[PDB]
């Protein structure tokens with residue numbers, strides 16, 4: 001349901017309006033052709049025109065399909081690619097991957113199959129595209145079209161850019177509504193942080209820390225920031241919408257309480273990928289509890305409440321003693337200097353709670369005081385039941401190691417060490433990260449699951465940076481606004497908006 005005049009809101013500017021953009025955007029190949037969705041599509045579209053580049057795009061697509069292929073169907077897919085791209089007499093031949101690597105790839109086909117068989121060829125193809133093809137695309141009309149899309153991206157976001165529907169939750173500094181972008185009709189989750197209370201509580205820095213952390217990470221399994229704007233009475237964070245409920249509700253109201261080990265495996269695998277994406281930024285979450293894991297319309301999960309996340313400088317440690325009683329790692333309860341370890345402790349808490357239907361250190365049917373709960377966390381070894389396989393027991397007690405130094409995932413390897421644990425032995429993380437594995441529970445669509453200081457002005461400005469680049473471009477693509485507006489001249493000619501004559 002896009003606005004009636006949406007083709008006028010997202011109307012392309014004349015290319016003459018984008019010269020300031022042309023000369024400031026860093027001409028980085030990975031950024032302009034891969035990281036940014038619309039740039040990636042436009043570069044691929046450019047390669048579609050030249051006959052020599054089309055084959056390389058098709059090959060990369062087939063390698064992307066190969067890496068997520070089922071294990072027992074690997075050799076079948078690999079040989080196909082070989083007969084189509086790596087054969088010298090093929091109509092679609094990869095010429096820049098010389099024979100000195102075609103032969104190596106054929107040796108691996110003569111041997112076992114690995115999901116990274118075509119990694120060498122794919123990187124060689126990329127090493128070729130970053131050269132002449134990329135610099136030709138920079139002087140092509142498709143990069144001028146990309147500049148037009150960036151011009152729209154940088155436009156100012158106001159309250160009139162969205163329309164709010166209903167209030168879906170309350171919090172500490174404000175509330176959470178459900179807004180929609182009028183021009184594209186995409187739903188979001190508005191997070192109103194009301195100004196008066198931020199300045200009274202002197203928690204300005206925390207709002208910027210959460211906003212910056214949210215706009216940085218671009219994970220499939222953490223709520224993403226799409227817009228950060230300001231109104232006459234609040235600061236708004238437009239985040240991913242999650243209508244599927246929260247994991248606490250499904251553990252206790254929908255559960256046994258608890259899930260089957262396989263169901264918990266799926267949710268744990270997605271939470272681990274979320275924590276991994278966060279730790280790629282040396283950002284620790286510290287707020288892992290079942291109610292913070294939200295489900296979407298499809299059944300997948302994301303980590304939601306980033307109000308307690310902070311970015312650890314590389315090589316640094318921090319102090320805190322923050323979180324929720326029962327989900328605080330011993331190093332946090334002791335108020336020590338820690339790194340990312342609280343999140344792996346939380347992952348242990350989550351896996352245990354999903355399988356067993358209660359926290360590892362307090363019973364569902366137990367009336368205990370915070371003092372005793374903490375004492376158990378610091379001194380008591382959790383017990384396990386027949387609901388846990390041996391692998392499930394293993395990963396849980398390894399993640400629940402009191403000594404953050406010996407805790408799983410807290411080595412130089414990081415989340416890698418966790419993905420390798422035998423508890424995920426039957427989990428294909430490549431397919432999971434690609435959204436290829438079916439979630440174990442799909443929420444029903446219709447379901448309902450539940451002043452003049454001027455220093456404030458400077459704070460206003462650094463917060464409200466506007467639309468976030470990758471989420472914005474993805475929004476454009478999903479709502480099909482890109483497919484509709486991204487039209488050129490008939491038969492490869494220039495459209496009027498891209499011709500510097502007759503502006």
Ligand SMILES: Cc1nc2ccccn2c1C(=O)Nc1c(C)[nH]c(/C=C2\C(=O)N=C3CC=C(C(=O)N[C@H](C)c4ccc(F)cc4)C=C32)c1C
Nearest residue numbers: 168169171172173174175189241242243304305448449450
């Ligand atoms: C299915 C259904 N039926 C009913 C019936 C009645 C009521 C609800 N529902 C739902 C339901 O799930 N609603 C819902 C939807 C769609 N999204 C969310 C929340 C989020 C979302 O999507 N993305 C983030 C990111 C980050 C947060 C987050 O940090 N929150 C904390 C506490 C917070 C801190 C400070 C604040 F000022 C405000 C909040 C929350 C969210 C909720 C709660």
